Subunit: 163 residues, 4 copies
């Protein structure tokens, strides 16, 4: 079974996060190794495997990027832009400079706002593209969002540093 | 050019981290887009690509896991279980979630963190050993497990931030 | 006087980079290493002076601490608990916000919930700071001492918000 | 008194699991929601009581705050503005420790340096806590009031350590 079936969910990008979280807790509770503590050797090993596949599935569907990437994998598509690159370098630069701005926590909030807006716009574009089976456009959105994700991770670092 | 030759480094797992950071700094300085701001569009775009590859190379080499994985790929190896290892990682994760509900969470976290770090250290030494002896199969196994450990290590640092 | 020490004027309004400039100026002057081979009395005095410059810098750098110090100069010290027990309406507001924070993890799309809460708290902080600044400027030390009071809670709430953010991602 | 509120003896030694779940007892009694439709006087009083319980749990749960509160009961009040400056030898140790912390990024192996430094700081903290717990039992308040200072510095150094850790992680 693929990851979507496992949770009884439709194969699509749009996902009820709370539903996934409920379906996962039911599975995790059911396939928890403690439920097989006295089973035969073979049964315990298969159950930890099943428990592992469930965690994998949940980890993959929980995150939009992995989920989108997974959706592409089901189509048989496996994946490995200069101006976008230069912009990301510029943004990275802007980020390293907020901690010298007059109001660092204000500049950080400002920066965080526009990065979140970018992420939102790419996610929306990704969703529309997956909806109309435009896989390569989708693949392109996925790469860019991986950049934005790292960028977002760096601003949270700054939020912890600055403080 | 591979990532190693790009920094003038020997192809091996053993790496001088400070040297890499200094070599990266010189490259990053040299190929920074500002140095090409008035160049022709063709030169600018090729320069940002070179700058991007340098950043990628640096990121790939500075992390032992990515570095080890890169070494495997240079041999034409690319990878896509160990039920007992799985179970133990589940137990460790379980133990980590209890740290909060301890007498001294701050002390139990420290204890747990040293255990995980020692474990990481042992897997890292094993990985180094088999890479040196071209035991790629065993090396790839070490890499997978270390990816588990890394995530675990990430979870303890999350709990440390909770307790601080 | 901390303000004297940095040659700065006694206000809540602070030239931030000027402070860091004065700080390094003093740092590079009362640097204890300069007295590493001196008499112990001389060396320990350098250390005490260096530590006091440290205290002074921390106090002025942080607006809340800066405002408490300005209050302190007026001979005013506050008992920052029975003073807040004096203001139960705000305590209730504090409770509503904490309740609403625990309510984030219990929606669907709770990440956008934290964003909404984080923006609100920030806006609340911006507001109380502006009120505090205007209050200290007009010398209403009482009406500043409760702004500090509210901002102390705000600082605590932001930490709780970070705790929720660290769990969500 | 805060100790009575939770029905604990007046001492430094404290079971977390008790208190933490004993907190929930007073909390689920004086919860202001029980007075949501009451007179305003009764509601605000409930709010004040719930807040005082909150302040009590916080004060007791933290060892440094607990120790300081114990001193406060003896009529003794702190003052880092002048007490810390009265111990230059320890200030030197503070500066040497910070210096040591700033040097870990400089080594050709910054990861393992921090780990050793972190182990060092943790060892120092556990030592001063042991001494504090020891002093407080023998009513040596000022030997304890001095351990509280060092521990307060230790708390700040740990925050500095995590800042450098976050710079690595
Ligand atoms: Ca954060
Ligand atoms: Ca944030
Ligand atoms: Ca740590
Ligand atoms: Ca941290
Ligand atoms: Ca954080």
């Amino acid at each position: 079974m693929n990851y979507f079936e496992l949770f009884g969910l439709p194969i699509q990008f749009e996902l009820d996060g709370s539903l996934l979280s409920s379906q996962f807790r039911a599975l995790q509770k059911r396939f928890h190794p403690d439920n097989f503590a006295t089973a035969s050797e073979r049964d315990r090993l298969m159950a930890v495997q099943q428990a592992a596949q469930i965690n994998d599935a949940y980890q993959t569907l929980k995150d939009p990027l992995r989920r989108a990437e997974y959706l592409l994998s089901l189509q048989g598509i496996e994946m490995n832009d200069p101006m976008f690159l230069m912009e990301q370098m510029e943004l990275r630069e802007e980020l390293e400079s907020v901690t010298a701005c007059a109001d660092p926590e204000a500049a950080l909030v400002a920066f965080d706002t526009k990065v979140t807006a970018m992420q939102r716009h790419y996610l929306a574009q990704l969703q529309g593209q997956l909806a109309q089976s435009e896989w390569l456009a989708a693949a392109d959105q996925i790469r860019k969002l991986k950049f934005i994700a790292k960028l977002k991770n760096e601003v949270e670092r700054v939020e912890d540093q600055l403080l």
